[PDB]
Amino acid sequence: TRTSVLADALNAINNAEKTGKRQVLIRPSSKVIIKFLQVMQKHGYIGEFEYIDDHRSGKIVVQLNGRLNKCGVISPRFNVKIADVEKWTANLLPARQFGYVILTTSAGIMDHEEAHRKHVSGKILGFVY
Amino acid sequence: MRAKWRKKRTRRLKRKRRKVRARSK
Amino acid sequence: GWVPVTKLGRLVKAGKISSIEEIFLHSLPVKEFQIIDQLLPNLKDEVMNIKPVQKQTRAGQRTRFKAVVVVGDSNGHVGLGIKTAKEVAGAIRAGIIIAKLSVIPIRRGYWGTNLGQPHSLATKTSGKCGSVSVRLIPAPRGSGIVASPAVKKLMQLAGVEDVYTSSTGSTRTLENTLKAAFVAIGNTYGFLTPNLWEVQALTPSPMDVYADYATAS
Amino acid sequence: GKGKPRGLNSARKLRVHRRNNRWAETTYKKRLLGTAFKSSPFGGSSHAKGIVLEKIGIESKQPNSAIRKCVRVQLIKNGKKVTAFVPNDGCLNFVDENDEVLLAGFGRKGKAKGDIPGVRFKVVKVSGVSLLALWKEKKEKPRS
Amino acid sequence: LARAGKVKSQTPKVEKQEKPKQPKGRAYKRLLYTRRFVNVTLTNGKRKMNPSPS
Amino acid sequence: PRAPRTYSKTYSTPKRPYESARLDAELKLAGEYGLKNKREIYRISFQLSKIRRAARDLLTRDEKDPKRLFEGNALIRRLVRIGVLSEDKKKLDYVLALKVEDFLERRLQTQVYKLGLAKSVHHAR
Amino acid sequence: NTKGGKKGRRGKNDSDGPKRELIYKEEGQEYAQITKMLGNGRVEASCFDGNKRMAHIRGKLRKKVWMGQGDIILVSLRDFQDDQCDVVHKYNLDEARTLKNQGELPENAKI
RNA sequence: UUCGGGUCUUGUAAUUGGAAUGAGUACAAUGUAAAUACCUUAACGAGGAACAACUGGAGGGCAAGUCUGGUGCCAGCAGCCG
RNA sequence: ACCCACUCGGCACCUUACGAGAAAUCAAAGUCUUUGGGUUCUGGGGGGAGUAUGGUCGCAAGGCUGAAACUUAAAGGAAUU
RNA sequence: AUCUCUCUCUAUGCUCUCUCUC
Ligand SMILES: [Mg+2]
Ligand SMILES: [Mg+2]
Ligand SMILES: [Mg+2]
Ligand SMILES: [Mg+2]
Ligand SMILES: [Mg+2]
Ligand SMILES: [Mg+2]
Ligand SMILES: [Mg+2]
Ligand SMILES: [Mg+2]
């Protein structure tokens, strides 16, 4: 079995980026993945995503800018506290200030900076750049 | 040196030891 | 006898280009060390290590010496070279030439506070030559280049203020380590970061524009 | 795909695995089996003292040569027979048999120095005087 | 004879020279600095310190 | 017993003892500012290192956070009081730099020699 | 030629001569007949004095001069120990005979 | 024109000085349960020989000598290489 | 039954590297410093050693499990002349 | 579709080691 759909999607995206291909096909998709993509779009890491979210499960096709470098996951979604977020950023993000650690928080799925602004940490979902 | 031969030798030694133990008993 | 063979070299000689930056932009086949000397004024010729090297063929040994050269100014662009040769001085010279030919620029990055003047490194950057993996983690102001002496020297030559490094593999092979470091440095500018993002249109090459002056007929 | 388990509730297993693996680190094993106390003549101790039995000039390992000069020591605490080397040139002329002597290791975490087989310990304080001092004149030993 | 206690029993012990008192702590450091970074006549060539009678 | 009599180490010894360039630098500093002990230089570096650590920590906390507003400012004030930091230079990045030369310059050993009174650093000492 | 000609014997050169001066006795140093040539540099050699001993080869002769059974040999006895002792100098057959003639060693063993 | 002044500032050697000091000593005063020691302080107190810094090293690792005499696979060094 | 066009599933190839390799090599040994798709199981210098001691499973032979003391500065992998 | 198809004992060997200046 595929256990983490989001992870697989991210892997696919990464592979596409590596290739230089400017379109993907996320296979099972839906909800969390969609939200992640939305967040990415907000900062403009992916160009435009369109899903044949049909009568089954959903299939996302991402027309992407290619400016995205890498987009991770971590499937043991660790319960991030408001202080060790810095540590996480240091570990995961390349630059000190460029890039976004994706957090699934009670306030919703968004990047790290936005979470900080709302002062709600949650669980790590992934990261871009 | 071959390892199989060594193993065989060891086994033989073990057997001998066992025999000795039996005798003692 | 400073007569060039290549067209770029000829152009450089004539004086219709004064910028290495342009060359870097258009990725030009440099094969004359003269060009770099002409354009890049002050560059420190530094030899790292001289490894004795042999190939034991019938009648005794055959001692060749492998010199490692790191060249560069103290502001951005850094040269890197290696040569095996019979005499040591000659080998060193050859390495220097090669290093000059190589010379690669760094995207000298920041930490967040900005303030002023090109500082340390852009991102967490890596490169592997052998097993050896070199990290370059951009270290805050004054946090002196922390590395293998060789790597420290290379960084100094480049013109980096403060960097954290992390080693993997057998770093006792100094040459390999140096190569890895060079690769990592190269990677720094070959990386997409929000400071790039906004696309700037292509400028024509000096090789295409000044093509009439490069050729003598 | 990274052989070790990576789950949120997978912790216990991970810990146990780590524990099991640790048992292969030689140092850790030494620390925890109690071989520092159960085995080894310097039983946990750092600077055991004993007494001279025989004054064997032990022949060295190869590339090198020369007769090396060592001491048979009966340790006062445990009472094991020990082969312990004496530093400097002709310090044997200050040791003598039936004399009390303090010993140390070899900067070797046990084991043996790079020429002397069987030897594991430096003779350091002959009758509580120290050998270095004796060597460089400095102080004189109680003997008669 | 191949017996223990050679060399030092054989070699004549030549006594230590009198020598003018080489300074201490701060002064010594200063002297060292003067020796190494103040002048040095070997400006062209190498940054070598200890020479030889050769 | 009494208890709270705590003794602090005050200096850091370098991890590599014969890294030549570092040693040379130290020697040069000693020559410049008359120093009996390399532990003096080491002491000062340790102090500076501590300051740097604090600054780093402050930076780790975001711009115009309460901690940053307090501790950083306090540090800056302290530095100004000693001297060392310039009056234009009060922005934490400067603190992160600070060199090593400046602490060996704003000290009685050098401060006496700075206006005269001695005509040599050893004399001043 | 030394032992077996070889490709790998011309990188040595031996200099002593057959017409060399015979070495005499010293203090803590005496003459031994070899009882049995043992392994690993060790050798069982009965002294002319009247003690059994255990003889040991010490450098020098370890590769340069090969030895056999029942040979007259200079042994410097250990001054601190006694049971383990070391070979210093091998005597030639002619040399041995001369020594015997002289009467420097006790007449008990034959060459 | 062949120097040179050393004009401007230093480095250098037993040379030769002209000024400081606490470390011991200490009238005493302070200190203190009483006295030590410190903080204060009148008297005595440095010309290299004194009022004396050792401790490791100098093939590499690793800063530092293809110096001088001795020993000669011995004596011994050497954490490992050697 | 043949022939072309496709796929689906399987054993495999050949070609490259644009990756990964310490390389030899690899369409996985790739997506592994830009390091967390899920899980089991093993290894931590070589030797002593798969030995000694226990335990068990066995008619036995043996298998499963599995040390330490001591011992050395190498053993080993791939390539190169 | 053109190969053609050859053959046996032979054991062992102990004596080092080496860099420069950039
Ligand atoms: Mg010859
Ligand atoms: Mg006082
Ligand atoms: Mg000394
Ligand atoms: Mg050196
Ligand atoms: Mg010594
Ligand atoms: Mg093991
Ligand atoms: Mg059993
Ligand atoms: Mg090998």
Side-chain angles (χ1 to χ4, degrees), chain D residues 8-21:
Chain D
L8 233 183
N9 295 36
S10 85
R12 163 172 266 96
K13 265 280 285 209
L14 206 172
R15 188 203 158 86
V16 172
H17 188 68
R18 186 87 296 102
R19 215 199 215 99
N20 279 307
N21 274 320

Side-chain angles (χ1 to χ4, degrees), chain A residues 22-118:
Chain A
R22 290 176 80 159
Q23 70 293 326
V24 309
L25 225 172
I26 297 154
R27 251 284 302 149
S29 90
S30 200
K31 254 254 85 182
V32 211
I33 299 91
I34 295 171
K35 293 197 97 174
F36 205 101
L37 289 171
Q38 275 277 276
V39 173
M40 288 147 81
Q41 210 159 246
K42 191 178 264 74
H43 321 294
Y45 275 87
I46 44 97
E48 214 267 12
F49 68 98
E50 179 217 59
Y51 28 76
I52 166 69
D53 265 20
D54 52 16
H55 308 261
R56 305 190 72 83
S57 58
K59 302 178 87 200
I60 315 178
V61 191
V62 183
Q63 301 86 54
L64 39 96
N65 297 324
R67 53 179 53 172
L68 206 160
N69 290 261
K70 207 261 186 187
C71 44
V73 268
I74 323 107
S75 189
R77 303 175 183 189
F78 303 115
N79 306 259
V80 194
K81 282 177 275 163
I82 211 89
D84 286 72
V85 69
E86 303 167 303
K87 314 284 179 186
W88 273 100
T89 61
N91 269 64
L92 296 177
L93 292 181
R96 206 116 140 215
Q97 25 77 239
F98 300 119
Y100 302 97
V101 199
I102 312 299
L103 288 152
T104 319
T105 71
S106 57
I109 294 154
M110 75 306 217
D111 33 295
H112 67 94
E113 46 150 62
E114 276 168 30
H116 178 263
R117 285 159 175 166
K118 305 178 199 178

Side-chain angles (χ1 to χ4, degrees), chain F residues 91-105:
Chain F
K91 280 168 188 177
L92 291 153
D93 29 54
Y94 301 110
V95 184
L96 274 165
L98 274 177
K99 278 192 178 180
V100 200
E101 197 178 45
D102 294 299
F103 273 78
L104 299 149
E105 276 185 34

Side-chain angles (χ1 to χ4, degrees), chain F residues 94-122:
Chain F
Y94 301 110
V95 184
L96 274 165
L98 274 177
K99 278 192 178 180
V100 200
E101 197 178 45
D102 294 299
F103 273 78
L104 299 149
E105 276 185 34
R106 208 146 283 99
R107 39 130 85 203
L108 261 186
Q109 178 69 221
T110 314
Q111 284 288 312
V112 164
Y113 177 78
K114 210 152 191 175
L115 56 146
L117 285 85
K119 280 148 268 183
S120 186
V121 279
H122 324 290

